[PDB]
Structure 1
Amino acid sequence: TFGYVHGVSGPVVTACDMAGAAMYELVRVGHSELVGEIIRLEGDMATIQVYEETSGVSVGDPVLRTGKPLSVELGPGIMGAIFDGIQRPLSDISSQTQSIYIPRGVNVSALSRDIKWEFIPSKNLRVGSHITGGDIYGIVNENSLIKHKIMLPPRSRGSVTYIAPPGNYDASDVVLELEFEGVKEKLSMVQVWPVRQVRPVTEKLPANHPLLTGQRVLDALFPCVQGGTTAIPGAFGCGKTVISQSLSKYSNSDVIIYVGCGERGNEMSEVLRDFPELTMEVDGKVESIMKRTALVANTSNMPVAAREASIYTGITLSEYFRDMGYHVSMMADSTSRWAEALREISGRLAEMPADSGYPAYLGARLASFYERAGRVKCLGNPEREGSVSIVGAVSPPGGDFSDPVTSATLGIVQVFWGLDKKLAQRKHFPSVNWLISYSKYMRALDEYYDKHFTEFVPLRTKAKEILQEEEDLAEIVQLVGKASLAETDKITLEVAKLIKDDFLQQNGYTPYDRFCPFYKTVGMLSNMISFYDMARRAVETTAQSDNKITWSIIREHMGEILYKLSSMKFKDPVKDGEAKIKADYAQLLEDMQNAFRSLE
Structure 2
Amino acid sequence: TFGYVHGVSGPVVTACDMAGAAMYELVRVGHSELVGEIIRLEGDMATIQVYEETSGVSVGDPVLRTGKPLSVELGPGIMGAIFDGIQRPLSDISSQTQSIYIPRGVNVSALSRDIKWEFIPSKNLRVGSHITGGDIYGIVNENSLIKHKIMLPPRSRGSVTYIAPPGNYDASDVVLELEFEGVKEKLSMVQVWPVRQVRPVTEKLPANHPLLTGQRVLDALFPCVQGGTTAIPGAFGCGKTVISQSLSKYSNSDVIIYVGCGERGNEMSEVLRDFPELTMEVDGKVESIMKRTALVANTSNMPVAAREASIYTGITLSEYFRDMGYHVSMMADSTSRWAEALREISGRLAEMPADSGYPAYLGARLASFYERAGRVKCLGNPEREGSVSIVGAVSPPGGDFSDPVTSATLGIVQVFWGLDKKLAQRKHFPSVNWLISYSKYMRALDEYYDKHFTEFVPLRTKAKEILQEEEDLAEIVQLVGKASLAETDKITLEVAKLIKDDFLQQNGYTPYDRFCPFYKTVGMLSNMISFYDMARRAVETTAQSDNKITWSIIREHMGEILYKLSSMKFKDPVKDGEAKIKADYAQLLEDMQNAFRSLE
Q: Same fold (TM over 0.5)?
A: yes
Q: In the superposition, relative to structure 1, how do residues 249 and 283 fare at CA in structure 2: closer, same or farther (>3 Å)?
A: closer
Q: What SS class does the counterpart of residue 305 from structure 1 fall into?
A: helix
> Are the counterparts in 1 of residues 336 and 405 from structure 2 also a CA contact under 8 Å?
yes
Alpha-carbon distance between aligned partners in 1 of 2:7 and 2:556, rounded to the nearest angstrom: 78
Shift of 1:108: 0.7
Q: In the superposition, relative to structure 1, how do residues 413 and 84 fare at CA in structure 2: closer, same or farther (>3 Å)?
A: same
Shift of 1:411: 1.6
Higher mean displacement: 240-249 or 479-488: 479-488
Alpha-carbon distance between aligned partners in 1 of 2:57 and 2:475, rounded to the nearest angstrom: 61
Q: In the superposition, relative to structure 1, how do residues 66 and 485 fare at CA in structure 2: closer, same or farther (>3 Å)?
A: same
Shift of 1:539: 1.1
Q: In the superposition, relative to structure 1, how do residues 473 and 292 fare at CA in structure 2: closer, same or farther (>3 Å)?
A: same
Q: In the superposition, relative to structure 1, how do residues 24 and 579 fare at CA in structure 2: closer, same or farther (>3 Å)?
A: same
Higher mean displacement: 398-407 or 183-192: 398-407
Alpha-carbon distance between aligned partners in 1 of 2:425 and 2:106, rounded to the nearest angstrom: 43
Aligned residues: 600
Shift of 1:516: 1.7
Alpha-carbon distance between aligned partners in 1 of 2:226 and 2:552, rounded to the nearest angstrom: 46
> Are the counterparts in 1 of residues 234 and 394 from structure 2 also a CA contact under 8 Å?
yes
Shift of 1:345: 1.6
> Are the counterparts in 2 of residues 262 and 307 from structure 1 also a CA contact under 8 Å?
yes
**Any idea what the Cα deviations from partners look like across 1:281-303, whole Å, max 9, x if unmatched?**
44455433322111111123433
> Are the counterparts in 2 of residues 11 and 304 from structure 1 also a CA contact under 8 Å?
no
Name the structure 2 match of 1:62. Answer: 62
Name the structure 2 match of 1:317. Answer: 317
**Any idea what the Cα deviations from partners look like across 1:373-421, whole Å, max 9, x if unmatched?**
1111111111111111111111122322221011111121111222233
> Are the counterparts in 1 of residues 237 and 420 from structure 2 also a CA contact under 8 Å?
no
**Any idea what the Cα deviations from partners look like across 1:475-520, whole Å, max 9, x if unmatched?**
4444555454211112111211221222222233332333221111
> Are the counterparts in 2 of residues 235 and 396 from structure 1 also a CA contact under 8 Å?
no
Q: What SS class does the counterpart of residue 313 from structure 1 fall into?
A: helix
Q: In the superposition, relative to structure 1, how do residues 43 and 298 fare at CA in structure 2: closer, same or farther (>3 Å)?
A: same
Higher mean displacement: 468-477 or 59-68: 59-68
> Are the counterparts in 1 of residues 23 and 40 from structure 2 also a CA contact under 8 Å?
yes
Q: What SS class does the counterpart of residue 350 from structure 2 fall into?
A: coil
Higher mean displacement: 428-437 or 67-76: 428-437
Q: In the superposition, relative to structure 1, how do residues 562 and 38 fare at CA in structure 2: closer, same or farther (>3 Å)?
A: farther
Alpha-carbon distance between aligned partners in 2 of 1:55 and 1:3, rounded to the nearest angstrom: 19
> Are the counterparts in 1 of residues 227 and 373 from structure 2 also a CA contact under 8 Å?
yes
Q: In the superposition, relative to structure 1, how do residues 555 and 120 fare at CA in structure 2: closer, same or farther (>3 Å)?
A: same
**Any idea what the Cα deviations from partners look like across 1:416-436, whole Å, max 9, x if unmatched?**
222233333323222222222
Q: In the superposition, relative to structure 1, how do residues 44 and 417 fare at CA in structure 2: closer, same or farther (>3 Å)?
A: farther
Shift of 1:164: 0.5
Name the structure 2 match of 1:329. Answer: 329
**Any idea what the Cα deviations from partners look like across 1:87-110, whole Å, max 9, x if unmatched?**
112221122111223222211111
Q: In the superposition, relative to structure 1, how do residues 546 and 87 fare at CA in structure 2: closer, same or farther (>3 Å)?
A: same
**Any idea what the Cα deviations from partners look like across 1:40-94, whole Å, max 9, x if unmatched?**
4467665544443556666775543322101111111111222121211222112
Shift of 1:324: 0.9
> Are the counterparts in 2 of residues 527 and 565 from structure 1 also a CA contact under 8 Å?
yes
Shift of 1:5: 5.9
> Are the counterparts in 2 of residues 209 and 448 from structure 1 also a CA contact under 8 Å?
yes
TM-score (norm 2): 0.93
Name the structure 1 match of 2:40. Answer: 40
Alpha-carbon distance between aligned partners in 2 of 1:122 and 1:173, rounded to the nearest angstrom: 18
Q: In the superposition, relative to structure 1, how do residues 273 and 586 fare at CA in structure 2: closer, same or farther (>3 Å)?
A: farther
Q: In the superposition, relative to structure 1, how do residues 581 and 104 fare at CA in structure 2: closer, same or farther (>3 Å)?
A: farther
TM-score (norm 1): 0.93
Q: In the superposition, relative to structure 1, how do residues 566 and 401 fare at CA in structure 2: closer, same or farther (>3 Å)?
A: farther
> Are the counterparts in 2 of residues 332 and 393 from structure 1 also a CA contact under 8 Å?
yes
> Are the counterparts in 2 of residues 19 and 45 from structure 1 also a CA contact under 8 Å?
yes
Higher mean displacement: 71-80 or 559-568: 559-568
> Are the counterparts in 2 of residues 29 and 35 from structure 1 also a CA contact under 8 Å?
yes
> Are the counterparts in 2 of residues 84 and 310 from structure 1 also a CA contact under 8 Å?
yes
Q: In the superposition, relative to structure 1, how do residues 257 and 223 fare at CA in structure 2: closer, same or farther (>3 Å)?
A: same
Alpha-carbon distance between aligned partners in 1 of 2:485 and 2:47, rounded to the nearest angstrom: 68
**Any idea what the Cα deviations from partners look like across 1:304-352, whole Å, max 9, x if unmatched?**
3311221111101111111111111111111111111011121222211
> Are the counterparts in 2 of residues 9 and 348 from structure 1 also a CA contact under 8 Å?
no
Shift of 1:274: 4.7
Name the structure 2 match of 1:83. Answer: 83
Alpha-carbon distance between aligned partners in 1 of 2:262 and 2:584, rounded to the nearest angstrom: 45
Q: In the superposition, relative to structure 1, how do residues 29 and 246 fare at CA in structure 2: closer, same or farther (>3 Å)?
A: farther
Higher mean displacement: 275-284 or 23-32: 275-284
Alpha-carbon distance between aligned partners in 2 of 1:159 and 1:447, rounded to the nearest angstrom: 43
Alpha-carbon distance between aligned partners in 1 of 2:361 and 2:79, rounded to the nearest angstrom: 34
What's the % identity of the aligned pairs?
100
Higher mean displacement: 113-122 or 58-67: 58-67
Shift of 1:268: 5.0
> Are the counterparts in 1 of residues 132 and 157 from structure 2 also a CA contact under 8 Å?
yes
Alpha-carbon distance between aligned partners in 1 of 2:268 and 2:372, rounded to the nearest angstrom: 25
Shift of 1:17: 6.3
Q: What SS class does the counterpart of residue 519 from structure 2 fall into?
A: helix
Alpha-carbon distance between aligned partners in 1 of 2:105 and 2:97, rounded to the nearest angstrom: 12
TM-align CA RMSD: 2.5
Q: In the superposition, relative to structure 1, how do residues 241 and 275 fare at CA in structure 2: closer, same or farther (>3 Å)?
A: closer
Q: In the superposition, relative to structure 1, how do residues 161 and 263 fare at CA in structure 2: closer, same or farther (>3 Å)?
A: same
Name the structure 2 match of 1:398. Answer: 398
Alpha-carbon distance between aligned partners in 1 of 2:387 and 2:200, rounded to the nearest angstrom: 13
Shift of 1:120: 1.3
Higher mean displacement: 109-118 or 539-548: 539-548
> Are the counterparts in 2 of residues 233 and 401 from structure 1 also a CA contact under 8 Å?
no
Q: Does residue 155 of the first structure (1) align with residue 151 of the second (2)?
A: no
Higher mean displacement: 127-136 or 583-592: 583-592
Q: In the superposition, relative to structure 1, how do residues 356 and 12 fare at CA in structure 2: closer, same or farther (>3 Å)?
A: farther
> Are the counterparts in 1 of residues 212 and 252 from structure 2 also a CA contact under 8 Å?
yes
Q: In the superposition, relative to structure 1, how do residues 285 and 512 fare at CA in structure 2: closer, same or farther (>3 Å)?
A: closer
Please list every run of 5 or more consecutive structure 2 residues that lacks an aligned counterpart in the other structure. none
Higher mean displacement: 590-599 or 145-154: 590-599
Q: In the superposition, relative to structure 1, how do residues 180 and 582 fare at CA in structure 2: closer, same or farther (>3 Å)?
A: same
Alpha-carbon distance between aligned partners in 1 of 2:537 and 2:15, rounded to the nearest angstrom: 78
Alpha-carbon distance between aligned partners in 1 of 2:467 and 2:104, rounded to the nearest angstrom: 54
Name the structure 2 match of 1:282. Answer: 282
Higher mean displacement: 25-34 or 165-174: 25-34
**Any idea what the Cα deviations from partners look like across 1:244-280, whole Å, max 9, x if unmatched?**
2321111000111111222344555555555555544
Alpha-carbon distance between aligned partners in 2 of 1:16 and 1:196, rounded to the nearest angstrom: 27
Higher mean displacement: 448-457 or 194-203: 448-457
